[PDB]
Amino acid sequence: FLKPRLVDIEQVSSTHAKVTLEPLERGFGHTLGNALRRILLSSMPGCAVTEVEIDGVLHEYSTKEGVQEDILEILLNLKGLAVRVQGKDEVILTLNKSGIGPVTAADITHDGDVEIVKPQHVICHLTDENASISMRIKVQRGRGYVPASTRRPIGRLLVDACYSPVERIAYNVEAARVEQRTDLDKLVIEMETNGTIDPEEAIRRAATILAEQLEAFVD
Amino acid sequence: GVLKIVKVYLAVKRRIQPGDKMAGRHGNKGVISKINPIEDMPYDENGTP
């Protein structure tokens, strides 16, 4: 038999890359190409905001003076924030801005571990010259999509968390160019990530999951 | 015959659910039957489900 190996990883942009698994025997290239996609799209460790507490507003459906966005819009913008944490499963992010001008993810004070991958993500726009906003953001790991409903003080808002760094996975099977063999197929996987997870480690995790699952019905 | 009357407002946020009606503009209607996971959906060649 033959053994597939991670031969080439290339990144076209900052979001998505194209991993390569060169040697595969006929038929496998279309079995792994679907297993590693179904696993990848449904279970990956990602970080997303879960609890946002603003200084002065009680509940979601309350406007705040000096901010163009409704508080609901601020929450929905924050849900899409793409951040990654290194060492601690839970973290608190503090945002402090003042003066007229849009606020961005880069305005958040950065700790040693938590770093934002897209510092151009606009959260809210400040219109009045003497307006201010201060919010605490709780960011944690997770797996899959966890609605807020299924998960105390009145001044702490709840936002649904969607821990899924990968958006759009596609694969294809091209015939290999081995100098002496035939029917050998190389596999290319495209992974439109949100920018938090690395491609090679993503493939490694999505394959360890399979290696654990298969050990059920096998010695 | 009433001393004081108090009104309290509740703001539910109804999500989508198997059973909720959903209709197009052309006259096609029908209830949702299953909220399939993203991976189970069909996808074109480029990968978009």
Automatic annotation (TrEMBL), chain A:
Listed GO CC annotations: cytoplasm; DNA-directed RNA polymerase complex
Ranges where the record places region Alpha N-terminal domain (alpha-NTD): 1-219
GO MF: DNA binding; DNA-directed RNA polymerase activity; protein dimerization activity
Domain of life, per lineage: Bacteria
Annotated GO biological process: DNA-templated transcription
Function: DNA-dependent RNA polymerase catalyzes the transcription of DNA into RNA using the four ribonucleoside triphosphates as substrates.
Domain notes: The N-terminal domain is essential for RNAP assembly and basal transcription, whereas the C-terminal domain is involved in interaction with transcriptional regulators and with upstream promoter elements.
Record-given protein name: DNA-directed RNA polymerase subunit alpha
Organism expressing this protein natively: Escherichia coli
Gene (UniProt): rpoA
Parent-protein residues present: 8 to 233 of 329
Automatic annotation (TrEMBL), chain B:
Superkingdom: Bacteria
Subunit structure, as described in the record: The RNAP catalytic core consists of 2 alpha, 1 beta, 1 beta' and 1 omega subunit. When a sigma factor is associated with the core the holoenzyme is formed, which can initiate transcription.
Underlying gene: rpoB
Name of the protein in its database record: DNA-directed RNA polymerase subunit beta
Family from the record: Belongs to the RNA polymerase beta chain family.
Protein's job: DNA-dependent RNA polymerase catalyzes the transcription of DNA into RNA using the four ribonucleoside triphosphates as substrates.
Leader sequence segment: none
